[PDB]
Design a protein around this ligand. Structure first.
Ligand SMILES: CC(C)(COP(=O)(O)OP(=O)(O)OC[C@H]1O[C@@H](n2cnc3c(N)ncnc32)[C@H](O)[C@@H]1OP(=O)(O)O)[C@@H](O)C(=O)NCCC(=O)NCCS
Ligand SMILES: CC(C)(COP(=O)(O)OP(=O)(O)OC[C@H]1O[C@@H](n2cnc3c(N)ncnc32)[C@H](O)[C@@H]1OP(=O)(O)O)[C@@H](O)C(=O)NCCC(=O)NCCS
Ligand SMILES: CC(C)(COP(=O)(O)OP(=O)(O)OC[C@H]1O[C@@H](n2cnc3c(N)ncnc32)[C@H](O)[C@@H]1OP(=O)(O)O)[C@@H](O)C(=O)NCCC(=O)NCCS
Ligand SMILES: CC(C)(COP(=O)(O)OP(=O)(O)OC[C@H]1O[C@@H](n2cnc3c(N)ncnc32)[C@H](O)[C@@H]1OP(=O)(O)O)[C@@H](O)C(=O)NCCC(=O)NCCS
Ligand SMILES: Nc1ncnc2c1ncn2[C@@H]1O[C@H](COP(=O)(O)OP(=O)(O)O)[C@@H](O)[C@H]1O
Lengths: 729, 402, 402
């Protein structure tokens, strides 16, 4: 019943009270403990006092305006507090969100107009506060975002976000975009979809426009002033209630469609959002809100929420704040870029570089090939002009920065080089030597290499310091990670210049010390090799792909093993064998190698040849190859599906630990985001490093339960799953 | 303990879903008509010795709500002590009622029970009653809810039944049902529906397409390809059946059970009940059983239920003269025939639901009374009736001629 | 042949209709919570031997549609072979489910059965399923449909029960229900309802008003006097009971059964089923009986049903230690007591639906388990459970301590 966290037995005040002569009360949120307003214990007590006062002085108050005295309106729940909630804390979590929503429900039912003055970003709990208001005005300023991105952290909008958005838009419309995706909207789009009712040019216009709306509202409709649509007697939920025959006919398909989108992955947040949405739409607003609290407490006390909060809030902010950037270095603006190789990698680097606003020179071994690389940027802009995302004036200024050439003289004035030629050290030595002298002196010399160490590639140029590894991923237009590799003679100043370039093209950087396979290529190899081994063991190919998808991967492994050329995977298998036999050792081959060579013997080496594990007709997958079952005697091995899933997840998590032991990675954040944004590690794990400390199965939860399952996997499928000594004790 | 006997087993003609003859007939009126036919066959029966009226009904809402069994008792003027209870076990409801009635008689605490079912699918469509398994996301997500149709397509996929194989069974169902009507097999049990003035409304299973050809069945479009695509039920099924790569959608509107209206009534009682009322026993309930299989492939239920009732009655497949499995989907009958090695000349010898229709609540009682008449016409002993059930259930009954 | 024994009998607390604790709880969850409590008491129980789950539900629509018994089997992870059937015999559905389970065990064709009922009246109101007896003018006109409340006031008018008489019984039910709770009688049978996080939702019977006084009950106004005028149901009843000039409306919200949410579950099995799974039998079901009486009063069913179950068991009123009749209305209990001269200290000794509530589909299983526990506490031998039923029906059961 109370608006406060305690009812027995000293927080800071974050709300400023101001009642004007008309009776309008302005609640200005200004948390003095940080640069943003969050739902910590200070806000709860501050809003509790304010709402108590709004009720006590109800006879002398005519309207309320909720505003913020910071760049952002309100940033939502305190992630630093929510990530510590244990299963035993389910009662405290439930009471906190009930108290938070008790305050908003009182604000929502005062009988007076309440307007939200959204100056900046209002995300999560911030938008939930604004959704409790009867009218929302947002300043159309730069950088302002609005949305409920709780699902991206493994949570749900538990401060009335699920309940109110369903009352506003219905079950289907609220779930499809703002809830299940957690998408962030610019204020102009927020006004279009209905999350915001009015826009203004600047933030100074907000409170005046808010107070003017209150004065007009009290005159145009005094009976409905301060009464949300769902608090009126004739309320009709958009799309209908779960008892409506129209919605009831399509409702059984919502969990199955959601099951299809998630491919069976163990991500409980969208499942709980959908349950709270439908269950809430069956009862009154207050009962619906309480149901929302219980589903929120089941997520926050869970483990997936811990992983996703760790990776997609803490680890991602540490990266975007210069955690990998060394010491302090001034910025060096990039005037022109030169891409070597017009393949799908080089053409993708040319598109993302020009889309950021850089002049690019795309060179190849002929003009015929350089134009087919620029055609990769044209085909994307043709599909982007139909969806309405890009304009014709900008799409032309974008493709104008891509100059397809075949002459090395066109690289004059290039102060940033990104090579993407074939995986051959002598070739990379050659193509860099023709240009090392044509480019400007302090030009960064980058190489989009998969496995070849950058230290050995740097000897092909004169300035060893400006040589650096700039690993992009296929396709470059979508993949958001750039793996910056540091050679032995790579300077810290070149490390920062590529760090700044990655942030300029809107991508996330990780810093990796030089080694064969780097971090991404080395780990993603263990993932695909574990699946090929299952195929050689006789496991059904359809079960292998299903185990890969239900693990949370964005692409099943055999399908991914066709995108990556099986010729390329065999080259890596020869290098690792030659390196061990040149030192006198006995190379122990991975069981996948016999499958790779058998498929090449059969002439099915991947999608490039049009034949691999799948069949490829007219440039599209036509299902698995029927002869694959006879070749490997599929069906003879039927292991548990969870045993297959763990084998793929554990192979990567263990190899990520080796990369941490060997010093390839210097931070777990780079390991987590690097695996998530680079090689598609399942987001619910929080990363391949978080998967160790956050493993959850029948054995239990924690690093101890990870080792037990790792040893259980080692005893049944091979000693490669034996945990390293760093994980022990 | 006390043996249960079938004394009467009648049904109504099955009117079709679109422009059906029985669409103007309330489901309560279908049941009362069968009660009145029982009175016409025994005008001196002391109805006070009737202990209960059990009716299966899968959508007990609207015209079929409020305990339609009790409504049947009160509307037909039956004694007010005659009870009236509605049960719902999906497709088995018609047979589960008869089994429950038989089990009531066996306990000695009931003497004479009316059992059967009613389902007017043209008036009360399937799913009108809602349900947690489908309309609650937390359960629909925990359980792997997939409609009956995809499970039927998945059966044909795993077991290797082609589109021509299921159309082949759909053909012989139409042929055997048409030959049964021509030979007059159904003249005694199919009670024509009449209005309050005695005028005829329907006297035949108007869903039958007796001139069906193998070429016409091949022209039809797979009727369950848009459902599994717009709802993603195909992907949900294959997440549990991961070794299956793709589902072959072979089931159409011509090899699947038809949506129809109908009702059935079975009079079950003890031996003493028949002697006191002059009723002549027609068959004896030998044994009943209830089992099930995987819920995603929910139509594999009848296989373990049949084995359980055979073991309970102390019989084997060779001891059964006639097998009657509801033709919900053609692949369901083919898998059941394949598992138990059912001789084709013993399986649904008078056609089934593909030809005549599947009134959910009444089908079990309809096909039971079908075997009562067929065992007598052939002068055979034992028949085994079973139905595949949504949610993965299964019910089987064994009768013996008397 | 075989005897049916009650091995477990548990129930949920009952939550109010207005501002009820269980209003946010799905009805399926109330049943799954009881299934998990049975698991807690017998973790090594082989659930594969459980052949059926029989739940009673009077409003099987919405959250309670689509065979909620089967949903309980699948959602609780029970074996798919455990069946699942919903039945509806109005107020006796909970007891009828237990009776049907017992008869199935006695027939030999079922070994271990879960029986009970569920009714979330705050989520699925009474009458949500519809029905021909009310929504069909032809059937309504013929059966002389009159709501249960008018029949209850008519019973009080005919039998000379005054407003003080019914309010006196209402006070007794509130007092004996309070003594039963404070005495710890219900400690083991009432299973608290919790959420997905383990947080408590309800652990007591919310509808109870233990501080009820005679003067407070007299201030209440007749709740069903407006339904009689707006609908003419009074004039309809007096057309059959023409010797009564006026109906004295004595029933208020304080002497009538409460509209609550609840669920109950009972485990019935054979002696061999209990010995195999290491279960100790708590009581033996001696006899069941189904009868009825006039459908306008529709609440006099208990008297002919109790008479029949006493005759079949070879017993008399003097042989029964405890009498448990559902307190649907105070006049219904007062008539049953006068008809059979039930001693006052034997009748509803632990209070009833007036104090604790009447979850339609679950009540029969709730009061069944209340007598199982009180027989063990008092160390008595026999008890008779009975419920009045809509449509003029009646169901009774005699249990024996073991
Ligand atoms: C608020 C936001 C939109 C813009 O932030 P910004 O102005 O760029 O500022 P920064 O990202 O540098 O963050 C500044 C501070 O705010 C804190 N902060 C921001 N949002 C926070 C939150 N939800 N919980 C806790 N702290 C938060 C940061 O931890 C940081 O604290 P620090 O500077 O002492 O280390 C961004 O921080 C954001 O995406 N917030 C997440 C909101 C969200 O998704 N909430 C979900 C749960 S309701
Ligand atoms: C559906 C609705 C939002 C847009 O309808 P419209 O303007 O006639 O047509 P469109 O949907 O093609 O408009 C384009 C935008 O709709 C948005 N949209 C469509 N369906 C949506 C949904 N269910 N939720 C959110 N946004 C949606 C798209 O994201 C798109 O944004 P974009 O133009 O930047 O790509 C509109 O009918 C409306 O305002 N009311 C419907 C209910 C509602 O408010 N839903 C929004 C939930 S946030
Ligand atoms: C299979 C099903 C989808 C068919 O729906 P429908 O399209 O309304 O059915 P119809 O009978 O109209 O069949 C469609 C077409 O096939 C034709 N057809 C059907 N059976 C035929 C036959 N034996 N020979 C030739 N044509 C036939 C019809 O004449 C019709 O032609 P049209 O397209 O011009 O109308 C529906 O009956 C169904 O869902 N039943 C399966 C059972 C089920 O899902 N649940 C019940 C419990 S198991
Ligand atoms: C009798 C009935 C109409 C009462 O409905 P209701 O008015 O919502 O009932 P409530 O108990 O919430 O309210 C009754 C009033 O009397 C009061 N009251 C009820 N029991 C009381 C008691 N024991 N002592 C004192 N006051 C009591 C309530 O507080 C309330 O007072 P209010 O009107 O000032 O709030 C309803 O419970 C009913 O129809 N039950 C019968 C069951 C039935 O018909 N069919 C089920 C199968 S038999
Ligand atoms: N988990 C599985 N993995 C691979 N193949 C399977 C699996 N389960 C069944 N099969 C295939 O199906 C055939 C029969 O399996 P069965 O045990 O009948 O499956 P279910 O019990 O699911 O119906 C087997 O010969 C096997 O080839």
């Amino acid at each position: 019943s109370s608006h406060h966290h305690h009812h027995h037995s000293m927080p800071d005040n974050t709300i400023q009270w101001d009642k004007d002569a008309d009776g309008i009360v302005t609640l200005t949120m200004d948390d003095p403990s940080g640069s943003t307003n969050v739902m910590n214990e200070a806000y709860i007590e501050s809003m509790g006092k304010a709402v108590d006062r709004l009720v006590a002085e109800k006879d002398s108050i005519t309207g309320v305006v909720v505003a913020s005295a910071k760049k952002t309106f309100f940033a939502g729940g305190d992630v630093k507090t929510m990530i510590q909630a244990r299963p035993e804390d389910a009662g405290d979590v439930f009471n906190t969100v009930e108290t938070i929503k008790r305050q908003l429900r009182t604000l929502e039912t005062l009988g007076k107009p309440v307007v939200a003055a959204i100056n900046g970003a209002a995300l999560g709990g911030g938008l939930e506060i604004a959704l409790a208001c009867h009218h929302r005005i947002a300043a159309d300023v730069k950088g302002s975002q609005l949305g409920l991105p709780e699902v991206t952290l493994g949570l749900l909008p538990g401060g009335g976000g699920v309940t109110r958005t369903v009352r506003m838009f219905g079950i289907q419309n609220a779930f499809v975009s703002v809830l299940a995706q957690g998408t962030r909207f610019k204020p102009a789009k927020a006004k279009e979809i209905g999350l915001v009712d009015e826009l203004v040019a600047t933030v100074e216009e907000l409170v005046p426009a808010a107070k003017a709306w209150i004065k007009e509202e009290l005159k145009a409709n005094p009976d409905g002033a301060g009464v949300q649509p769902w608090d009126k007697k004739g309320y009709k939920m958009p799309g209908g209630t779960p008892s409506s025959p129209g919605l009831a006919a399509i409702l059984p398909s919502f969990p199955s469609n959601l099951r299809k989108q998630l491919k069976g992955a163990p991500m409980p947040a969208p499942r709980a959002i959908l349950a709270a949405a439908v269950e809430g739409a069956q009862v009154d607003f207050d009962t619906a809100s309480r149901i929302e609290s219980r589903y929120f407490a089941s997520l926050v006390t869970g483990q997936v929420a811990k992983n996703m909060m760790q990776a997609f809030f803490f680890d991602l902010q540490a990266i975007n704040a210069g955690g990998s950037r060394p010491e302090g270095i001034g910025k060096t603006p990039i005037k022109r870029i030169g891409v070597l190789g017009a393949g799908m990698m080089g053409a993708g680097i040319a598109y993302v570089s020009a889309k950021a606003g850089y002049e690019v020179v795309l060179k190849d071994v002929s003009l015929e090939a350089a134009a087919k690389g620029k055609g990769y940027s044209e085909k994307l802009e043709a599909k982007a002009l139909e969806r309405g995302r890009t304009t014709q004036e900008r799409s032309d200024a974008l493709l104008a920065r891509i100059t397809p050439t075949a002459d090395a003289a066109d690289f004059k004035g290039v102060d940033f080089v990104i090579e993407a030629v074939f995986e051959n050290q002598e070739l990379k030595h050659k193509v860099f030597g023709e240009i090392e002298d044509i480019v400007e002196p302090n030009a960064i010399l980058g190489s989009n290499t998969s496995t070849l160490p950058i230290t050995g590639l740097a000897t092909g140029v004169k300035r060893q310091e400006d040589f650096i590894g700039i690993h992009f991923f296929s396709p470059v237009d979508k993949m958001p990670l750039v793996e910056i590799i540091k050679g032995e003679k790579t300077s810290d100043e070149a490390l920062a210049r590529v760090f700044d370039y990655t942030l300029a093209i809107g991508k996330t950087p990780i810093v990796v010390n030089d080694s064969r396979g780097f971090f991404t290529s080395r780990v993603i190899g263990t993932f695909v090799n574990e699946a090929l081994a299952m195929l050689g063991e006789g496991v059904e190919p359809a079960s292998i792909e299903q185990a890969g998808s239900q693990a949370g991967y964005p692409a099943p492994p055999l399908q991914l093993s066709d995108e990556l050329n099986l010729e390329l995977m065999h080259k890596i298998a020869v290098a690792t064998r030659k390196g061990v036999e040149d030192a006198g050792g006995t190379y122990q081959p991975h069981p996948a190698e016999a499958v790779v060579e058998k498929m090449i013997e059969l002439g099915r080496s991947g999608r490039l040849k049009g034949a691999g594990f799948y069949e490829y007709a007219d440039g599209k997958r036509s299902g698995l190859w029927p002869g694959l079952r006879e070749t490997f005697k599929s069906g003879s091995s039927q292991p548990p599906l969870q045993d297959m899933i763990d084998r793929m997840l554990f192979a990567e998590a263990l190899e990520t630990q080796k990369c941490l032991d060997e010093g390839v990675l210097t931070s777990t954040a780079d390991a987590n985001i690097g695996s998530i944004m680079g090689i598609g590690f399942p987001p619910w794990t929080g990363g391949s490093a978080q998967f160790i400390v956050g493993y959850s199965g029948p054995a239990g939860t924690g690093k101890a339960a990870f080792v037990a399952r790792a040893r259980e996997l080692a005893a049944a499928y091979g000693d490669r799953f034996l945990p390293p000594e760093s994980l022990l004790s | 303990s006390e043996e249960a006997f079938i004394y009467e087993a009648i049904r109504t003609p099955r009117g079709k879903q679109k422009n059906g003859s029985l669409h103007e007939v309330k489901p309560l009126s279908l049941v009362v008509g069968l009660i009145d036919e029982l009175r016409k066959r025994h005008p001196d029966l002391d109805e006070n010795l009737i202990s209960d009226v059990i009716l299966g009904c899968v959508s007990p809402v609207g015209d079929q709500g409020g305990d339609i069994a009790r409504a049947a008792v009160l509307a037909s003027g039956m004694p007010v002590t005659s009870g009236g209870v509605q049960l719902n076990r999906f497709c088995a409801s018609g047979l589960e009622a008869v089994n429950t009635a038989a089990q009531k008689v066996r306990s000695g605490w009931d003497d004479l029970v009316l059992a059967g079912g009613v389902e007017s699918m043209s008036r009360v469509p399937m799913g009108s009653d809602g349900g947690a398994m489908g309309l609650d996301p937390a359960t629909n997500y925990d359980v792997m809810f997939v409609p009956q149709s995809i499970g039927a397509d998945l059966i044909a996929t795993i077991e290797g039944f082609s589109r021509e194989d299921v159309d082949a069974y759909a053909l012989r169902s139409q042929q055997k049902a048409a030959e049964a009507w021509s030979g007059g097999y159904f003249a005694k049990s199919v009670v024509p529906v009449r209005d309050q003035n005695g005028l005829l409304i329907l006297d035949h299973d108007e869903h039958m397409r007796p001139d069906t050809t193998k070429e016409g069945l091949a022209k039809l479009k797979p009727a369950f390809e848009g459902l599994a695509a717009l709802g993603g039920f195909d992907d949900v099924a294959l997440q549990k059946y991961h070794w299956v790569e793709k589902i072959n959608h072979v089931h159409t509107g011509g090899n699947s059970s038809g949506i129809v209206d109908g009702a059935a009534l079975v009079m079950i009682g003890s031996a003493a009940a028949g002697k006191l009322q002059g009723l002549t026993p027609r068959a004896r309930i030998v044994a009943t059983a209830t089992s099930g299989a995987d819920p995603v492939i929910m139509l594999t239920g009848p296989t373990p239920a049949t084995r359980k009732v055979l073991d309970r009655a102390g019989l084997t497949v060779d001891d059964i003269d006639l097998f009657e499995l509801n033709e919900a989907f053609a692949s369901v009958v083919l898998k059941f025939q394949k598992d138990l090695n059912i001789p084709d000349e013993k399986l649904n010898v008078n056609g089934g639901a593909i030809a005549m229709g599947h009134p959910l609540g009444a089908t079990g009682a309809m096909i039971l009374g079908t075997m009562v008449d067929e065992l007598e016409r052939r002068n055979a002993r034992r028949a085994l009736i079973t139905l595949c059930i949504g949610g993965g259930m299964g019910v089987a009954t064994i009768i013996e001629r008397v």
